[PDB]
């Protein structure tokens, strides 16, 4: 029994070992209680405004749409404390953890962005935080690792498997299955078993709510489409949620194409995978013919995940949202273009969304369209990755 529907059509559920079902049911109950509690809502709002910096700006691009009939706004989650949208939902989940009497936090990370967010929220709110991170991401993201440790978090490299996000997820779940009595698992995306896809959406939906108010104020109408990258689905569903019932507003999610879909080295399960059961959920995933989970690939560690949240799978199935992919090289060009022409260094994750918007503009330059891209994070963490690429291609 659950208080809330665990499925979006066929997708979702609670495919966890029996031992963890009490933890999931307790979390759902705490969340439903919290959502009706004015005191919880007031504390969450206070943290979002006065600690994290909400509302975030909606920036009209001045130079990158020149010569076209596209108007492009960027929703500036890059300006949130910590550098990405992740901070929104970690503040809510940390408050839920306290509401339940939990003193410790488990989290996984790939971009190190959710790790940083979990570490900062735990520091503020007095929780003991341990973060699992693929050891390949460890040796590549040593700066973010040190940030987490500076803020008092334990960072645990994971060497198994691809040594990336999927493997960090596995270890976090193994941990939480012998520590759920005292530790809250702070899942970092809108995926995993119910109630996480629902909680993460509700704690990210201020993105789209703000965007809607801001666009009505500046343009007097809703966007023709909103565009967001999709690694697990949190920033996209946060932007999408408040527009789902606005049927004229397109919802476009951008999965990583990596080296190219045809190479098999990508992270685009929603359009190029097959439904399966893992990560506690029934959802599209990259898998072999035998049902083994395949390793994903992206230049962006935050999108390097071979599954996707169930609400996106559902929104795609019914045609409410459309999903596309963008390759490493297309993402890199968008990163460079935003740096040089708007003075904003975007996360390589977010650069996938920008890259698709640029394509919509350049492919049909006389099409009048009002677009919003969710700039889910800043690209400070990515400048070394980008440098080593530009140096290897003789471009610097």
């Amino acid at each position: 029994t659950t208080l809330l529907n665990p499925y979006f059509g066929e997708f979702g559920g609670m495919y966890v070992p029996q031992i963890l079902m009490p933890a999931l049911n307790q979390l759902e109950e705490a969340f439903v209680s919290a959502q009706k509690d004015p005191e919880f809502q007031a504390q969450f709002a206070d943290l979002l405004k006065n600690y994290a910096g909400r509302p975030t700006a909606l920036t009209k691009c001045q130079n990158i749409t020149a010569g076209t009939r596209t108007t492009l706004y960027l929703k500036r989650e890059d300006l949130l404390h910590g550098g990405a949208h992740k901070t929104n939902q970690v503040l809510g989940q940390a408050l839920l953890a306290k509401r339940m009497g939990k003193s410790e936090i488990i989290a996984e990370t790939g971009a190190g962005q959710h790790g940083v967010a979990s570490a900062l929220a735990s520091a503020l709110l007095g929780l003991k935080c341990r973060i699992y991170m693929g050891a390949k991401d460890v040796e590549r993201q040593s700066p973010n690792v040190f940030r987490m440790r500076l803020m008092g978090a334990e960072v645990i490299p994971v060497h198994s498997g691809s040594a990336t996000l999927k493997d960090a997820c596995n270890e976090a779940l193994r941990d939480w299955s012998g520590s759920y009595e005292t530790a809250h698992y702070m899942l970092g995306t809108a995926a995993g078993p119910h109630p996480y896809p629902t909680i993460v959406r509700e704690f990210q939906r201020m993105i789209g709510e703000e965007t809607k108010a801001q666009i009505l104020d500046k343009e007097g109408r809703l966007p023709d489409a909103v565009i967001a990258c999709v690694g697990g689905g949190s920033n996209a569903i946060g932007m999408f949620a408040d527009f789902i019932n606005d049927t004229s507003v397109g919802l476009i999610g951008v999965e990583p194409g990596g080296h190219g879909i045809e190479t098999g080295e990508h992270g685009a399960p929603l359009k190029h995978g097959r439904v399966g059961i893992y990560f506690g959920m029934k959802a599209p995933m990259m898998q072999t013919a035998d049902g083994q989970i395949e390793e994903s690939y992206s230049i962006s560690a935050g999108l390097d995940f071979p599954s996707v949240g169930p609400q996106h799978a559902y929104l795609n199935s019914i045609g409410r949202a459309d999903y596309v992919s963008i390759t490493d090289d297309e993402a890199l060009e968008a990163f460079k273009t935003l740096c040089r022409h708007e003075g904003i260094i975007p996360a390589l994750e977010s650069s996938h969304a920008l890259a698709h918007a640029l394509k919509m503009m350049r492919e049909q330059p006389e099409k009048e369209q009002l677009l919003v891209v969710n700039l889910s994070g800043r690209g400070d963490k990515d400048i070394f990755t980008v440098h080593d690429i530009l140096k290897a291609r003789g471009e610097i």
């Binding site: 029994t1 559920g13 609670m14 495919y15 966890v16 070992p17 029996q18 031992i19 079902m21 009490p22 198994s160 498997g161 999927k166 596995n170 779940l173 193994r174 299955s177 012998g178 520590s179 759920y180 009595e181 399966g276 059961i277 893992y278 506690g280 029934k282 995933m285 898998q287 035998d290 049902g291 083994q292 989970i293």
Partner: protein, 267 residues
């Protein structure tokens, strides 16, 4: 059927069941078959067998490495089912249970998976990441193919869950020793008499305790507490691991361990 006949015979002899677990194909197909024949010949009352899975989220490092060894030898689910058929041809009465991860069951159709289990002579299936709340299509397919669906009684079980497991489960009930993942180093110490008693009141299938069972004292303790038997996996797998380069000595030490564990089940 096989579980009912085993437990009736063990009850007559005032014995508990000792049920080893191994990963099929670890370290190879041929050595795995020899390993399983040795476990039976040394006193195994039943078998629990895992199909190598890419992401075993309920297993600790010992059984993770067993899966990796199986994958290194190229073991696929299809090859696992060919092994299962051969094991059933050798051993017509021993109950054979699979410990599966959900995606391998769901991949090419739940019904097709259980149909293949029936074809090869499997007796039960436990899907580690399918709780009773999600089990409907799995247990229906199992029962449709004369396969017992196994459910887990965790140490935090409440009464509504007790009644569900007792009602929907067949063959045996998996009584968890402790929270966490599989592993011999972590011994379950929490008393389980209360759960064992409730399961019996609700007419659940007989309980086999698993997780952390690595010594004969733990086997006798589970039997003494009312459990019908005990399952040991990581303890068995570490012997395989320790002896990879010495196949003969591996079988020797496996027999020594199994015999002692089964001896402790003779209450």
């Amino acid at each position: 059927e096989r579980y009912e006949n085993l437990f009736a015979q063990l009850n007559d002899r005032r014995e508990g069941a000792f049920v080893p677990f191994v990963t099929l194909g670890d370290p190879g197909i041929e050595q795995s078959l020899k390993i399983i024949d040795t476990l039976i010949d040394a006193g195994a009352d039943a078998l629990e067998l895992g199909v190598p899975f890419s992401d075993p989220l309920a297993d600790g490092p010992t059984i993770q490495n067993a899966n990796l060894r199986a994958f290194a030898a190229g073991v696929t689910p299809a090859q696992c089912f060919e092994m299962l058929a051969l094991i059933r041809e050798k051993h017509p009465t021993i109950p054979i249970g699979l410990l599966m991860y959900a995606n391998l069951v769901f991949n090419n159709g739940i019904d097709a998976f259980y149909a293949r289990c029936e074809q090869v002579g499997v007796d039960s299936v436990l899907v580690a990441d399918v709780p009773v709340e999600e089990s409907a299509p799995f247990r229906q397919a199992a029962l449709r193919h004369n396969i017992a669906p196994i459910f887990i009684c965790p140490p935090n079980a409440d009464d509504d869950l007790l009644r569900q497991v007792a009602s929907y489960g067949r063959g045996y009930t998996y009584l968890l020793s402790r929270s966490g993942v599989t592993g011999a180093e972590n011994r379950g110490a929490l008393p389980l008499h209360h759960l064992i008693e409730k399961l019996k009141e609700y007419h659940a299938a007989p309980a086999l305790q698993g997780f952390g069972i690595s010594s004969p004292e733990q086997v006798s303790a589970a039997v003494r507490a009312g459990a019908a038997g005990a399952i040991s996996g990581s303890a068995i797998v570490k012997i395989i691991e320790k002896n990879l380069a010495s196949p003969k000595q591996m079988l020797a030490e496996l027999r020594s361990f199994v015999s002692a564990m089964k001896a402790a089940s003779r209450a």
